[PDB]
Amino acid sequence: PEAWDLLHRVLPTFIISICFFGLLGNLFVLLVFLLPRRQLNVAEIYLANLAASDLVFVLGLPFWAENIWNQFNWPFGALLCRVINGVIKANLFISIWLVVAISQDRYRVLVHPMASRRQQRRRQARVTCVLIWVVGGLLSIPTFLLRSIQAVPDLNITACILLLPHEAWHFARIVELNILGFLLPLAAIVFFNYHILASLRTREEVSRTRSKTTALILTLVVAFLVCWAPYHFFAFLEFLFQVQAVRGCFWEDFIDLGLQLANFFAFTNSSLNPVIYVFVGRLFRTKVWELYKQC
Template identity: 45%
Template structure:
């Protein structure tokens, strides 16, 4: 396969859309000078991704521990939010590999299998996160707008099946990454890189179209509709009913905060993906745009990945029910420790009597 690697700078970095990096056909033929900001970006990328991974993993593990080990079973919304935390944890577990890769001047050291798995994990997060948010916004929509007529839909069993369907969809949509990612030596750059090689431009743009349609446009439309109806319900004529259902309101405010954070973090990324596709098709061009794509592809990727760290923070700041669960879980752990201490005391007393 003849692959063109005379690409602009933004197409030879391991970020942006993980499946549009080091790919064939990503240049419109321009030869623009590299941006002066690259040295700073190369220096900051490994540090940023390492810090993001450590803090994000700690935060999302904490969220999962609270949801999974609390004495009360999870509500439907909490099932969706715990799966969102698991998707974020998957992404954050993959970032250290890319941090090491950037620090090593983009020489991939972890073999072909990890090249595929790491990038597939990132892609599964991209699809999974937004679809879990579709589920959680749909749950809030049913809870507040159609509580009487469709309340049966809000059952934990159905929620778990829906989450399984989202994970299966994410795995299916990540198959091109698993299939086309591989480790190759690039003589032009003197690196052995983890790249994606599509069999044709048609396949490449088909994958881009699927990402935008199923990973952004369609889920965004569903989230926007549900959010609009939720906000109307919260401020509508039935406020008295919602005041009586204070738990539902608290859960809804947390969900709205998580949705807003996700959109603020990911919309710039997807808009830039659209511009990058137009650039690669030759419909737009110029060195100014080339350098803007260079810088924005990095900054918007940082912003998108930061969402995985923001969610646990939002649970603590906005989620009153979550803070209550944390407090109750703390009491559970304290009681267990007291019982364990009492048992040890009794055993030591029995041993003393036995020795006498």
């Protein structure tokens, strides 16, 4: 179909652009934090971990751009086929669960400002972020194992694909990818940011007697849904097609195209998260200004 020809023509440019902005943003974050090497805030621990996760996340995109150029005829070795898609599923989990960890800490820090004064947060922060990097590594092992180069006879290409050994792995893939990757952290993010926003509404209500933060807190949930809901929606339609709960030429054309567009669109998260979680803050902007004052 024409749409695939168009996709092969244009989608590498979109991928390369999202890669470029992702590298630029996350490198800028990492620099402005780590250039004054010796110390960081507890918030900056999570934010630096997040910027690193989104950096390594977009680091795999140029290979996929140069795979869609060459028309999905995977140019690289079978090992790189395992490694790239492994680090891309790992950093999906690590980035998403780090924005969970941020929203949790931010809840503890803004809804309980005194108890989070007494609690030893910085230890829990280091432990949590490195535990997330570990568990996100481990949850990627299934991708390292099952991703393999195979011929696709309908297309006359060798493509880097999941050689899923049994149909049970479709249920395992969809349960882990939609429920753990999108659905559980969405629910946690919405819980924490609701309790935050309700507390800041109460603070504003009392303060007025004698809205940027609400805009940012809603922008977190909006950006998360905009990035991740389209892909996990198409992934759900794919799983339904593997169940043949949906069936026909329309569905297979729609799903297969949408998975590509939505998947590479989801990498916009690596570009938006530096903006929303870092660049908008007055503190960060002063930290830029004062490290421009020490060129």
